[PDB]
Fold this sequence. Notes:
- Chain B: It comes from Anaplasma phagocytophilum (strain HZ).
- The structure is a homodimer.
- In chain A, 31% of the residues lie in helices and 25% in strands.
- The first copy, chain A, is α/β, with parallel strands linked by helices.
- Chain A has one domain: Formyl transferase, N-terminal domain (Rossmann fold, 3-Layer(aba) Sandwich).
- In chain A, helix 1 runs parallel beside helix 6.
- The longest helix of chain A has 24 residues, at 158-181.
- Chains A and B meet through strand 7 and strand 9 of A and strand 7 and strand 9 of B.
Amino acid sequence: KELRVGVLISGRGSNLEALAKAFSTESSVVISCVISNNAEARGLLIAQSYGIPTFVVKRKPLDIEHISTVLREHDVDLVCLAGFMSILPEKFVTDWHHKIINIHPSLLPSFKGLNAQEQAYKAGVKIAGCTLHYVYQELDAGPIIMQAAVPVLREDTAESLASRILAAEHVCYPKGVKLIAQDKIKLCDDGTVQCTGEDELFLFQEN
Amino acid sequence: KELRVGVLISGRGSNLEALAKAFSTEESSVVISCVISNNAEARGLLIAQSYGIPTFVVKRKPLDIEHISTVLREHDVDLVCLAGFMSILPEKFVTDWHHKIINIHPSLLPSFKGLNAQEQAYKAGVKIAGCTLHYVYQELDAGPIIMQAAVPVLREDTAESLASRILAAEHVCYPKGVKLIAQDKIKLCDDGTVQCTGEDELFLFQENF
Lengths: 207, 209
């Protein structure tokens, strides 16, 4: 109980799971709540198996006052988007500036937006990966914290490449949050992000 | 001495040097037939001459494309390789050498198209950068990708430091790809993407700092 995290989900919560496994030892970080905009989100069950309180909110229109209410009430320092499917409103992004992050299944700034893996596959790139980044006003364009690269093999499908990238997301997200919790992440004057400790912000994952 | 290559340059010829060293071996499948600069001061011109490769300088603005194509035809070129060539290629030239031109770009395309791709990477604050070998088609920096090599970006890098690490990876990437082409291992798929028909791989991870 030092860095308190809130995780926003809409789906299976595989990244949430990685995050909950990583920080339930010895650990500096606490996931204080998980919030979903989908009552059918399987990630809610993962959350409940780790003893983490869960909350379902209305989707359309998104009940953002309830989200903020839950986050304030659980003393959240850092909001992690992990498969959350909505466009967040301006005030909320403004309000949590420097305190919301996301993981996106491409090597940004390439392949912003939905369907990032399919886009890469059709593109014929030979290397792909994931990016952890602060959530700013423009979708998928805030400053980059960590990146991890994976290869695309001759025999891949769009779906098999996704699994390889998702595998890499599982390693990158928790490492990233850990660096934030132990005070080693720093936004610089030029708007780029840098680590003040020994650790590196790049990962090369081979498969 | 069977795949004949023409190399187009504008600067110091670093990638040219890596290619000429790679293919000078007595048992090489690839021959560099000519070297062409759009610049009378490109130091790569002296590298070419040290290898006994004929060199040619063409007018720059407008790019004298017919002089270029005449040189290439008279040296029996099969593959046109741009290696730091700084001139937009007019659509007629790209038609005239249909599917026979490749280029090494110093980024992980499709990110950072255009000039000074390394500086773009540096200001973007990516943690991973690299280079892409690709066919030159009509659309700038968007022809089918042949090979890509990944390179880390360090905390203490400048634009030029990072440029140097990318260049180092280009020295490994450019020769590799040309040789796969020379082996007849490179095939375009039905969807337009490239594949290798052997044990070789089209991605490279250059882990070194």
